[PDB]
Design a protein around this ligand. Sequence first.
Ligand SMILES: [Mg+2]
Ligand SMILES: [Mg+2]
Ligand SMILES: [Mg+2]
Ligand SMILES: [Mg+2]
Ligand SMILES: [Mg+2]
Ligand SMILES: [Mg+2]
Ligand SMILES: [Mg+2]
Ligand SMILES: [Mg+2]
Ligand SMILES: [Mg+2]
Ligand SMILES: [Mg+2]
Ligand SMILES: [Mg+2]
Ligand SMILES: [Mg+2]
Ligand SMILES: [Mg+2]
Ligand SMILES: [Mg+2]
Ligand SMILES: [Mg+2]
Ligand SMILES: [Mg+2]
Ligand SMILES: [Mg+2]
Ligand SMILES: [Mg+2]
Ligand SMILES: [Mg+2]
Ligand SMILES: [Mg+2]
Ligand SMILES: [Mg+2]
Ligand SMILES: [Mg+2]
Ligand SMILES: [Mg+2]
Ligand SMILES: [Mg+2]
Ligand SMILES: [Mg+2]
Ligand SMILES: [Mg+2]
Ligand SMILES: [Mg+2]
Ligand SMILES: [Mg+2]
Ligand SMILES: [Mg+2]
Ligand SMILES: [Mg+2]
Ligand SMILES: [Mg+2]
Ligand SMILES: [Mg+2]
Ligand SMILES: [Mg+2]
Ligand SMILES: [Mg+2]
Ligand SMILES: [Mg+2]
Ligand SMILES: [Mg+2]
Ligand SMILES: [Mg+2]
Ligand SMILES: [Mg+2]
Ligand SMILES: [Mg+2]
Ligand SMILES: [Mg+2]
Ligand SMILES: [Mg+2]
Ligand SMILES: [Mg+2]
Ligand SMILES: [Mg+2]
Ligand SMILES: [Mg+2]
Ligand SMILES: [Mg+2]
Ligand SMILES: [Mg+2]
Ligand SMILES: [Mg+2]
Ligand SMILES: [Mg+2]
Ligand SMILES: [Mg+2]
Ligand SMILES: [Mg+2]
Lengths: 51, 148, 193, 99, 203
Amino acid sequence: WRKWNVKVNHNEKRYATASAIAATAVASLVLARGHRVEKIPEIPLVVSTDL
Amino acid sequence: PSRFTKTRKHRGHVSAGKGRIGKHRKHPGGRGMAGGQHHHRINMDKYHPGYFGKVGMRYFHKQQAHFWKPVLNLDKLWTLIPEDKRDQYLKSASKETAPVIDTLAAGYGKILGKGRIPNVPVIVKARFVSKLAEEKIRAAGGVVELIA
Amino acid sequence: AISKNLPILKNHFRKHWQERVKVHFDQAGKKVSRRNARATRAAKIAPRPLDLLRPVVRAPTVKYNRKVRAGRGFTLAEVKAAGLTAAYARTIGIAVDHRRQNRNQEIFDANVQRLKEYQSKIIVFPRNGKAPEAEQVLSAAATFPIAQPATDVEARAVQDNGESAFRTLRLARSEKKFRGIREKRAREKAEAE
Amino acid sequence: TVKTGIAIGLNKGKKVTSMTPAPKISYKKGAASNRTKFVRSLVREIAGLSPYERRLIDLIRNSGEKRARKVAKKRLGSFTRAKAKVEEMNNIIAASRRH
Amino acid sequence: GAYKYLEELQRKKQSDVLRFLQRVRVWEYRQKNVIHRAARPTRPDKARRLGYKAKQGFVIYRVRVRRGNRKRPVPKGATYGKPTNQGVNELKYQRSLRATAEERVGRRAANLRVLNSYWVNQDSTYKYFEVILVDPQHKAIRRDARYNWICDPVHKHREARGLTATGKKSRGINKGHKFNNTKAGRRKTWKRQNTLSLWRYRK
RNA sequence: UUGACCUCAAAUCAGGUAGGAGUACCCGCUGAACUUAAGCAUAUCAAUAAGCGGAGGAAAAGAAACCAACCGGGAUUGCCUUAGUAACGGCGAGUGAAGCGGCAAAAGCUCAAAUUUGAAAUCUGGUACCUUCGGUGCCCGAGUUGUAAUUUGGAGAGGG
RNA sequence: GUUCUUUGUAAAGUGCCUUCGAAGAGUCGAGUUGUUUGGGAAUGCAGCUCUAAGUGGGUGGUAAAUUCCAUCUAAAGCUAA
RNA sequence: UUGACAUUGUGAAGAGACAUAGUUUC
Ligand SMILES: [Mg+2]
Ligand SMILES: [Mg+2]
Ligand SMILES: [Mg+2]
Ligand SMILES: [Mg+2]
Ligand SMILES: [Mg+2]
Ligand SMILES: [Mg+2]
Ligand SMILES: [Mg+2]
Ligand SMILES: [Mg+2]
Ligand SMILES: [Mg+2]
Ligand SMILES: [Mg+2]
Ligand SMILES: [Mg+2]
Ligand SMILES: [Mg+2]
Ligand SMILES: [Mg+2]
Ligand SMILES: [Mg+2]
Ligand SMILES: [Mg+2]
Ligand SMILES: [Mg+2]
Ligand SMILES: [Mg+2]
Ligand SMILES: [Mg+2]
Ligand SMILES: [Mg+2]
Ligand SMILES: [Mg+2]
Ligand SMILES: [Mg+2]
Ligand SMILES: [Mg+2]
Ligand SMILES: [Mg+2]
Ligand SMILES: [Mg+2]
Ligand SMILES: [Mg+2]
Ligand SMILES: [Mg+2]
Ligand SMILES: [Mg+2]
Ligand SMILES: [Mg+2]
Ligand SMILES: [Mg+2]
Ligand SMILES: [Mg+2]
Ligand SMILES: [Mg+2]
Ligand SMILES: [Mg+2]
Ligand SMILES: [Mg+2]
Ligand SMILES: [Mg+2]
Ligand SMILES: [Mg+2]
Ligand SMILES: [Mg+2]
Ligand SMILES: [Mg+2]
Ligand SMILES: [Mg+2]
Ligand SMILES: [Mg+2]
Ligand SMILES: [Mg+2]
Ligand SMILES: [Mg+2]
Ligand SMILES: [Mg+2]
Ligand SMILES: [Mg+2]
Ligand SMILES: [Mg+2]
Ligand SMILES: [Mg+2]
Ligand SMILES: [Mg+2]
Ligand SMILES: [Mg+2]
Ligand SMILES: [Mg+2]
Ligand SMILES: [Mg+2]
Ligand SMILES: [Mg+2]
């Protein structure tokens, strides 16, 4: 009966996921994270819906 | 989490920060609220005057609900009108057409009088009213309409 | 065991309580099964919905009567008015309640109307065999939502006959408060020889 | 009834257009009936009075309705049944050893 | 019909005709064995309203149980304990004599299921009962939709589980404010109010 | 003399059933003390452990002798809440539910008491056959001290 | 889904008129004892003594008498989730 | 152990009241 799960305020959960999304542009961030994106066109990388 | 806690810091110190003289033993004062009228009276009066003994009358089978009756002060009131609709009614303060506010429908029981609504006429439907709240309401050309 | 300026607590843990601790570890589990059960049933139940047609009903007590909420079933009266008998209405997916009573004509019309609409908007397949496949609406509830009735208009003229409301309440409270006594002064003054 | 339309006071409550429902038979569960009436009468005159029932009527002739009640209220449950039982006794008396 | 008269007659237990009867009969019973088969209902109208039927499958037993308090067993009165618990002699027993009656016959006829039971007579020493029973494997009962519920295994020894009418009585199974402790069935409802309910996302 | 009936027996009588086990969970009975109160007897631990009887895949409960006091609700069960509240309590230590509201699931019913009385219309069993979880014929038997049809309070029955 | 027997001079539903309308007892209830309950002039349970009625009866969380009102229909029974 | 109530019924004489007919109680 130890606590296994944690409650996060739903709003703040979104502040986080939002924040997270926003950093996936910001190429240095991406770069910093592992991820080999030197030799890619641009960031955000967007690609045909045909995918 | 364990790693941030002061017991981690006490490791290697003999007494876990509980003293060599006075130790940490099972229950020195007694357990729970023991001795409240004896060796723990000083803490009880001050911090908790009023604790022991009785006042007032018993009510067997008291069901709250019976007494449900949330209050709304004039103070707000106008908040029970959606904003768009609200400004429309503020300007054109009149008889003939004045907003109807079901405060029972807003889930209030009684209207109290905290302070100043504008001079717009309002039709106020409520179960109860404080003498003043209603006075102030009329003083802007509203009436209170008594419902249930 | 009393110290500092702390609030007095009441943590009832002096029985063998570690013996009756339920941790809903199966919260995810049940939801799924719960979901599967509905899906198995929805299928088994052919094109019928998962629920029955419930009635409108004003809530009990001083506190909730402002609201109107789904009831259990339709009362022999309502069912009758809406043009069918219960024995049948029970087979057409209408809930009937022999217990409930009619005393308010606003609600009775509401319910009868509710029944009318339901009837028109369902279709009852014949007993024969054919079973002309017709796709299930799962809810009857969603389909025929219950709503709060309109009690007034948005704006209207201010009529003030002048009588304080407040005072009417005080007076009203009063009248009841002495209602008895004055019937004793009516009984005691009647026995004036 | 009729409700006053306000939220305190004598006929406290919301005005609403009324209905008065068709009556439930289960509301006449008490009700006599020609059948039971007959049977009970007949059974009565078979088995007759019982010990405490005799004493009750002899009490009635010799000390009145008020002491009959007091005693009967001990015999039976209560003062209300005792009322009922003494009545029932008076009618045994009048109907029989009189008219 | 006759039944309505028997019914009304039985309610006059202190009637010269009924106490003649009661006295003769209570002597007859007391001579026989404490459990014994009954040829028929002595109260064909009572039996009948309690689910009895005069067809092969239905069985009546008459049984005798001692009256009075439960003397608490304990050698020499000795209770070995706090003194609220020192009582021995005014102690009552939570089940009724009717339960004990049903229980002892039901044990005596394990191949039967007990359906119900009614009081017939007492003196100072004994309360006399008649338990009505059903044979769940007699085909007259296995057919007949009205009584073959009794044939299921969930109804084995209903008398031993407080499931007959006397049972449900003392179990306190009724609706209402007066039966809060005991009605979903006391022990189960205690467990409920003494269970700690902890969620994943703690409330 | 013979034939019943009531009630009671017997059989290696024809066919069946019960026991023991398991017992996490379930329905009852019975029933502590350590402990807490800084001592202790009421209280508390606890309507708990130990002991006893009885079930199932769930058990139990269940179609209101309910809740309410409202514009009323409407079988049962459980979750969230009501609420550490109403209340109990050397009113000390401690204890402590329910009604409404949201939700999960939903589902309703059976007798007794009634003259079939122009027809016991009902049923176990044996038997022969058959399309064998059964049916039909026939025969013993049950049953009128009442087996079916009919009706269950929401009603419902008899006449027209 | 198909296919064979038509179960029937069988069964059931509904509207008006009239007369009816059977509804569980050593139980309900009461006193006392004891146990239990948050249940407080007594929450349930049991023992013993008393013991009903039929416009009756139970409940309506402060005892009692009086008058009303509300609300169900006990002392028998089955039932999935 | 002692009392009351229940198991507990049938006569007869004698006391006891409606207040010197016999239902009732020792
Ligand atoms: Mg911590
Ligand atoms: Mg850590
Ligand atoms: Mg560290
Ligand atoms: Mg250091
Ligand atoms: Mg340090
Ligand atoms: Mg260190
Ligand atoms: Mg140091
Ligand atoms: Mg320290
Ligand atoms: Mg040390
Ligand atoms: Mg020191
Ligand atoms: Mg206190
Ligand atoms: Mg404010
Ligand atoms: Mg706890
Ligand atoms: Mg402890
Ligand atoms: Mg688990
Ligand atoms: Mg559903
Ligand atoms: Mg078909
Ligand atoms: Mg036989
Ligand atoms: Mg002991
Ligand atoms: Mg005690
Ligand atoms: Mg409790
Ligand atoms: Mg937390
Ligand atoms: Mg054999
Ligand atoms: Mg066993
Ligand atoms: Mg115990
Ligand atoms: Mg311990
Ligand atoms: Mg101690
Ligand atoms: Mg200590
Ligand atoms: Mg000690
Ligand atoms: Mg206790
Ligand atoms: Mg145990
Ligand atoms: Mg098994
Ligand atoms: Mg099953
Ligand atoms: Mg299941
Ligand atoms: Mg069951
Ligand atoms: Mg019913
Ligand atoms: Mg109602
Ligand atoms: Mg309910
Ligand atoms: Mg406290
Ligand atoms: Mg407790
Ligand atoms: Mg709900
Ligand atoms: Mg069913
Ligand atoms: Mg009944
Ligand atoms: Mg006990
Ligand atoms: Mg008590
Ligand atoms: Mg009263
Ligand atoms: Mg039955
Ligand atoms: Mg059941
Ligand atoms: Mg003596
Ligand atoms: Mg004897």
